[PDB]
Design a protein around this ligand. Structure first.
Ligand code: ARS
Ligand code: ZN
Length: 194
């Protein structure tokens, strides 16, 4: 069935943070607080911050999964278009069908769910590096929102779950995602309509 998108900070006070990048033409990845929507270029570095009041225990894991936002498409699996699925951009870890990848982490793990056929990517939770107040994961989105035979101009949600080493839910949060050539301009345009 459709995975839960309900916000849950839980014991460890789990919330997401984003860089305050602005909307300059030369931006690759920008977050809109007003929309709670990320704007990112294809395959480019997408920083998502993990904020906690208390450090989760050893072997805590952080899962990312994309779902369609619209009620009628929610039961459909989010996957890459046949073109992007075929193109030789493989990192030698990520399944070629998977929209979401993590870069700069050789403990990354990918799941085709045997029951739901859902795609997700999981990394170990590492406490904030000295002189930081959050943990940063670098996500990569390997299809454009406009891809015919993929998302095809349908809005998606990314759901970020915090789970312990035995797979118990510790926390959940979500943000809308648009993968597009001009993230800056598109945020400015989508914010214009307010
Ligand atoms: As991004
Ligand atoms: Zn595509």
């Amino acid at each position: 069935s459709v995975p839960s998108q309900k916000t849950y900070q839980g014991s460890y006070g789990f919330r997401l943070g984003f860089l305050h990048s602005g909307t300059a033409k030369s931006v690759t990845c920008t977050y809109s607080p007003a929309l709670n929507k990320m704007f990112c270029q294809l395959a480019k570095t997408c920083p998502v911050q993990l904020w906690v009041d208390s450090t989760p225990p050893p072997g805590t894991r952080v899962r990312a999964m994309a779902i369609y936002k619209q009620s009628q498409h929610m039961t459909e699996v989010v996957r890459r278009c046949p073109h992007h699925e075929r193109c030789s951009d493989s990192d030698g870890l990520a399944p070629p069908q998977h929209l979401i990848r993590v870069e700069g982490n050789l403990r990354v793990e990918y799941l085709d769910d045997r029951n739901t056929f859902r795609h997700s990517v999981v990394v170990p939770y590492e406490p904030p590096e000295v002189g930081s107040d959050c943990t940063t994961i670098h996500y990569n989105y390997m299809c454009n929102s406009s891809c015919m035979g993929g998302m095809n101009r349908r809005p998606i949600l990314t759901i970020i779950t915090l789970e312990d080493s035995s797979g118990n839910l510790l926390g959940r949060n979500s943000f809308e995602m648009r993968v597009c050539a001009c993230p800056g301009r598109d945020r400015r345009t989508e914010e214009e309509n307010l």
